[model samples]
Target: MPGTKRFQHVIETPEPGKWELSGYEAAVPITEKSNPLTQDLDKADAENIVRLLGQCDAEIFQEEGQSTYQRLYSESILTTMVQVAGKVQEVLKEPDGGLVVLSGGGTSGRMAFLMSVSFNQLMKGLGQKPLYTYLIAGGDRSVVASREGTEDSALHGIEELKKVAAGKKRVIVIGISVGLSAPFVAGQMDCCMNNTAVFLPVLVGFNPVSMARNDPIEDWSSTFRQVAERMQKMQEKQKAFVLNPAIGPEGLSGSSRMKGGSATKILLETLLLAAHKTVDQGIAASQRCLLEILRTFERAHQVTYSQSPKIATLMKSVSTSLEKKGHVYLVGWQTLGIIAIMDGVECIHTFGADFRDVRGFLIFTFSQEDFLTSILPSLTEIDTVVFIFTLDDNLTEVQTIVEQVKEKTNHIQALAHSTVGQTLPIPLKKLFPSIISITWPLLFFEYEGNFIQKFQRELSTKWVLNTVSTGAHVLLGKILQNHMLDLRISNSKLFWRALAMLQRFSGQSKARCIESLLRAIHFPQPLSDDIRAAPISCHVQVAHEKEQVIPIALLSLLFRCSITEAQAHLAAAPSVCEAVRSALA
Candidate 1:
């Protein structure tokens, strides 16, 4: 009865904007809240899954109505963008020991790395010194692999920041944590606050400051919310900035890699591009210019979802490959290549999938000979190969690889982009049985051909790839009621998420859920008192080496079995979903 009373609010249908209320899931931030639109996501078909994702992403650009949350287009957000752009321009104009560092954890960190690399490339073309740098929580390797346990160390975060900005006189550190919950980002923000004269702190996320994480970080003097509050107080004097605009919850609950990562890319690109224009073309970082850039991405969102039917079909193909235990490969060039790789790498963490399940490779990195000799040998009828390219890519190379791949498998597809008047050569188009060719209207702008066009194409590719990977996993039953059932419990944030999932599904008390989670994390090893008393960081570190901790924990609770018994049941079951389903039945 106590558990029932405690969870009654969750059973009730959550109303629109219910998350914004003070009493509704009071402790959960918007970034972690289950989306009302996607409550039934687990049962949706491929098409509906894609459609639901589009609807959820559309909320990023949703105009603020009577809701208590500010949106992407909110006046306050626009104003903050203009101001941040101005700061970036100032740093660009005077590059005397000045640096702009973008830092985050997991997908947020990967987005930072992408933006930093792309923007720095743009600066090189303009004959300007590169002023951008990036730091992922687990270092550069985190970009391709999920080393999320490092995200729990605030001290590590501070050390990385100091190392990156050691020689810089004026440093602009943009700390991104979708839920404003990563201790890594929080430590960096606090470091910047401690020395404002040398460092400018900017916080980017999707939750209001009030919803920032308040849990006490281990061995830390202050919580994430405490640091956020200090930054908010400093905003009055322009010493710090907090750019949080609620874009509703994710399509898959607590999966910030989707909408949250997309929004971060959109915002950072707008700021960096505005700064570049201001310095190069003498265009002021005006609110109007900022809005135009934001709207350009808004148009991109519209264009991408307009082809949802094709995307959904692609999802089906990907799901087929995954279901058959076959592989899905994406090959591209330049920025789109990076986008492709990022999507593939994230799938491992997002879906508890094998690294070989969905793989991405860049053509520049893999030569024609290498592709033919090394990769083509692995091709099969069940495997799906997709080529991603833009008009700027070398068409000859794309065609050559496509011809070679065509011989190995007929399951090849293409995701090509070009202007409205331009299209892929017909001779080249006939190689694939299907294509998702995205045509964009030519926008008359100074940098349309060079920068803006490429950025739009990259964003579109990101959207499509994200859809395919997420939808495929959804169809594979990796999700349970919008929650990732087998997520890697590799950090403090994820540890809590796994515990919460156990509690939500098992109707167990918090204490009971934590006990089961610990039992699962320790598995065959005996649970010692010292291990139980150790900080959650230790539990998470141990969990990083464990597989299917949440599923095992849930099974233990549901079956009222010991950890060994849970493991036996799990090993006997075909999939996590089936294991849980059988227990429930």
Candidate 2:
């Protein structure tokens, strides 16, 4: 009775629709606000970390309550999805008449690229012309490296859209910005609004249009919010569409790559797949069909997180490798390989990690000769190498590399996939001490020669990799509370995020935070009036080449120290979080 009484008192009342409140976190977008469920994420252990992350992800599928925020399963969202799919089907019908271009910045852009690749492959398999094109802010190279500075360039976005849609009679441009804050995507949407006959713009993000970034974009005539409002007006005539279902804040504050990225993939894939079925099987792009596809992905989420304990163990392994100054390599095949590479590439901007810290290699590009000579020679005992593949892949090659890797380090692991009748061989499975094998239903293979199963596998792989990479960084203390404290301020969006974080932690005014950030960015030199008045784009350009700008700024404000003194403190502290913690204490 005593324990029960204590527990009852400990049960805090739910903050019902707290995020919907106008006073919430200075009225920032939900995508940028902190999640209440993860306030203590920094102090949680490995298993608890995984549990917290799974709970956070479950919010994506949570049904609408009394709140005004629309969710993934809300009726309005379903109806919009149906309409978007209808447009996609129209484009598919006349392959020569139109092009569907998906564009975004950073993680949103990465998902755009992945969706284009998968759908284009589906088209090729059906013996039809591929109809998808993707444009990241910095082009293809940004897919693997961090070139987020380009996301601030509205002119560059217009130029890329113009180049990609050239000569197409009708083009559907889907601009994805998780917070509806990317100037790159806004530029494209504005351009589409200018030439409505040739371009149909669809904006995909997680925030409500009211919360879209309203600040003036340098040298641009309108803000992102203005462009979104224009799209809303055109939606009455079905000339444009905006599909932004509120999917709660990420487990880690402002880390859109987690929930935001996953939701973007779900929405776009539902549209593409529904259109594909309509064309191939004569199924109508009805609300029922759209809901069914969305439900399938919801199941994918459940199936992936069911093995939370296993994922937790893998997260610990990755964290241990990172703490030891060791490398983590993910080798995968086919679409799974693409997923692996994406998780690896995002760590640079997400956590300010080294490119070599986490690397992904695909089977097609991974040569046995090179593995035996160049890569294998550098392998050490601390490095963690994971092989990601399915039973459908060439197991012999996986086994071959597994054996070669075994000679170098015993810290090898695997993320294997199989169906009811197909599984990895016992010997190959026994080679690794840790393996997370997911078995899907045989029904997944019955649809379109297992194409659906392949996509499900890719989604499952993405969830696991996201967990491992994000959890590992959390364990490495890259996060403060729920925030990405060491994130790269490489664009205008990130620059604003840096300011928000500084204000949040230091309880300083916005102007004070701005001065601190500017000082940190231009360290070792005094701020001239010209430098203080410089556009945000210029500050971000300089910040892109610098390290730990946010941490340095926060430290300077918290301790009332010079930028050099803050840098010295950061150098002496074990991690960024520790420096802030000690200063606050």
Candidate 3:
């Protein structure tokens, strides 16, 4: 009894990593060690995750029948790299090429981004230069914290697509939709297919048994529709039995990010790598190798499942720290560097907040001719400054910049550096999945397009200018009031806004004022209508010294109805009162 004690087994429960938490949940805090890379493995199952990247759940592939119908490891990844790389290489291979993918930082989209980077990295390793891109939901930061994203920010999607295309590069866009981002990504995918671009969709949960409340991408896009229709036929033939059920339902339902993301990464990576090698040496990777590579994917999946929840728990600390303060700042180089800026920006944009109270700032202090020192002031007091450092000269300058920031704030949250050399502070290979966020846009728009140029075209033109005010979309100013009164807002909120405007001009009660104002619109009955004409016939403004309100009972408000049946009745519907009663009815 003493040895056993009163047995209180403190079993740890599973939770989502900062990198994998669904949008429905709150963002995990950024710890002193928070960085693009650390966030992935720093959470509760981090050690499990890092080790699992290489762990093979040998059990998965051992299953009888279809599960075993696998490609060799080397071959699988190479096969994927070959195809994916080839697709991108073909575009990037051009002097000014364009390739695109609609990925909004959810698992599928994030895979596309890393795939693009790895593809370019592999292509260059083979002495073949190429470029590629991926468009994520909330840009790259969404990869870590999917802020204010509805999986559809269609406008953002189109803007990202435009960034990735330029000059003579052909556009090939692959849209990832386990549950696709909104029209933001979908609309662009639509535009891509319409423009003769390559359209592929890697459905995360392709298994028939997986919950599917939505139709496949093929049904959404004309290009993929036929292919999906064909796949449907195959499913019917199999009689509801899934072929190679993509992967089991993720530990978190619909989280293809764990298994689905890894599988696509392997498949796409292998496909592209194979193509690159074949082109370089005229030989393909062995099929046996691909099977082994899938084992690697299984490892990635395991790593996700095995991650240490410590970081997640630590995140609780970070969140609390953040709640106490108004702002957080990030300072680092390259991908981690950009994340510093991105993470903060997302908080501001999503919640309509300012710098201090939002998530935090990733201050990119670089000597890149475009750098600014004013940004350093963002860090003040002892709070925290998250630093992502590297050996590159860019990193060197960033440190100097951080010193400048530290002058303002002593608080610093730092992620450990993965040293590339014993003497140097950081390792390049180790940071592969970390801060690539910084270069995501750069990698995506390999075709040399200006970021602003790509985005400006898609910026919404909606502004606070309309003919009416004081409604649900009250931000809009009344088009009529805009010109009528310059810097003169005569309407009050406590009273009806549009009705007040009518009353001030038409000399009517709140209810029927609108109708009286309508009669004054077309006729030369009042303002600016040639004051000298026929003894000042349009002298209404001068004659009617009182606010131009009409009585609620006046029928003059119904005077000029349009030709339509509905309009005819309201032609003389004078005053705000008559219009509201008649039209609303």
Candidate 4:
């Protein structure tokens, strides 16, 4: 708590507040058989409401059940989302280089793609250079799907990032992992972190408190130590960790993205807003705003934890109301094409649960091919389903799949998007211009209390371990429902993101996440020559090999650091970099 601030939001008591409901909960023709959330919703109002949640971090309504709708409010959380959304607008206002995504799990990776797409549109609309090439481990494939497979190792990460580097300059680079687990992404992040100019790395996540198994943070990783030491000396470090158990908890007992993903979006955009203010408002004004955010988070918890939905009602369904179960499945036409083979609706129906059974999801692509194709794989039984589509949309394949699944569950029992003239059955018109993902930002805005004032409003939820990319520290956020619970921190840039999350969510400062990130990387201690010695801007004339002074430095320097540290951060070697250059990963 000493160094952190939690995200918080406050609306004058009883002033109009934000609300969140999924597309199903927002569907037209509200089916009585459908879960109550949607059944109770006003179609037009439902559409607007679902879209609204996408815009914030607090109002999260999950339709994981067929019987009723479920919800969670965090008006405090939305304060940060709105704050950050403003920040991102301002950041884009600046004439900066392209932004690259450096993330692994949950929204960390997904955001990379979304940000890139949004950046491109923003750039083209304003006649600027479009942000290009996200470095998600699974590349574009992971954008609409969860690439948990890639987050498991350093090699896959190395393969993903080099493709984006292509030796670019002054690029706005970002790497995200709810847990900071992918070594390769970390490796590239390390490289960029050491840059003296041009390239900037924005590392996003909750400064973790516990490491998910896949996390890179660990005591044994030598690189983490060096990074911490260097950052401490510079005094530019920042952190953001979610302290609210209500906001998140680990998935698979540790994945942070569940909550961390939403946290990442809020943190990144908020810092971007603060940074934007820095240009004209004067650095002090921006600093004040940051402090103001901290104060706000302080108040959020009072409102957030004050009430409760009947727990007995939460568990009466075939599925779990357990927060972890809130981690839903995001299946699409492409995903279903492959996954349906192994498992799909039949299994889910037999389990006797509805969409809320798992919590939330948006099947963007059609359920056709894969849903049709999946029959061969015999996939695992999925308990929930959230269908967001325009049955009339132009995709015959998807139409077929949706029809198939309808057999498993009553058509009326489902939440669908349908419109005039189309048979596809999905109506996305209501949430247009505002991507469904925008619902996340909206949800943040809907919390009932001021987030900045919440309990233990600490930013950069510190991961408990000491080491960069350590397994334990990296995964803590993920485990905390993707709390981003802790930011993956090491330098000023990530510190900024940490700062944003803190201001909005905890009413804290980057100071905490920065500290935790440093510790995670082991910067608290001194490093050996190989670890500390980095490439100096101007090399001491190396007339004779021994005549050259031995360089000593930590891993935080962008233009410097050691071979091991570089390898650890970038997750790349000549070979991997080359691969990334070609986008072959």
Steric overlap count per candidate: 0, 0, 117, 183
TM per candidate comes to: 0.93, 0.93, 0.44, 0.40
Give the least accurate 10-residue stretch of model 4, judged by summed lDDT. Answer: 460-469
- Model 3 lDDT per residue over 469-565, tens place: 0011111111121111111111111112223333333333433443233333323343232322212112223323223222221224433232233
The residue-by-residue lDDT of candidate 2 on 1-585, one tens digit each, is 222321121112124444245255546689988899999898989999988888888888898897488888989888888888888888888999689999998888989988898788888877878989999999878766667787887898999999898789989999999999889999999999999989999999989998988877885889899999999899989999989999999998888888888888888887778778777677668888777777888888888888888898888889999999999999888778878888898888888888889888887257656766767788899998888888888888788888888888888878888886785687796897557888886663323446667667877888889888988988887788898877777777788778778777777655666778889998777777777767777788888888778889988998888898889889998876777789977
Cα error, residue 218 of model 4, in Å, equals: 11
Per-residue lDDT of 282-349 in model 4, one digit per residue for the tens?
A: 44224355444433432332222221111111112112212234322323332122222112221121
Candidate 2, 277: how far from true, in Å?
Answer: 0.6
TM-score of 3: 0.44
lDDT of 2 at 581: 84
Per-model CA lDDT versus the true structure? 0.84, 0.83, 0.36, 0.32
C-alpha-based local distance difference test score of model 3: 0.36
Clashing pairs in 2: none
- Residue-wise lDDT of candidate 1 within 535-579, one digit each (tens)? 777788888888888888888899888888988988998877898
| Cα lDDT for residue 418, candidate 3 | 29
Question: Candidate 3: lDDT of 487?
Answer: 14
Q: What is the lDDT of residue 400 in candidate 3?
A: 56
Clashing pairs in 1: none
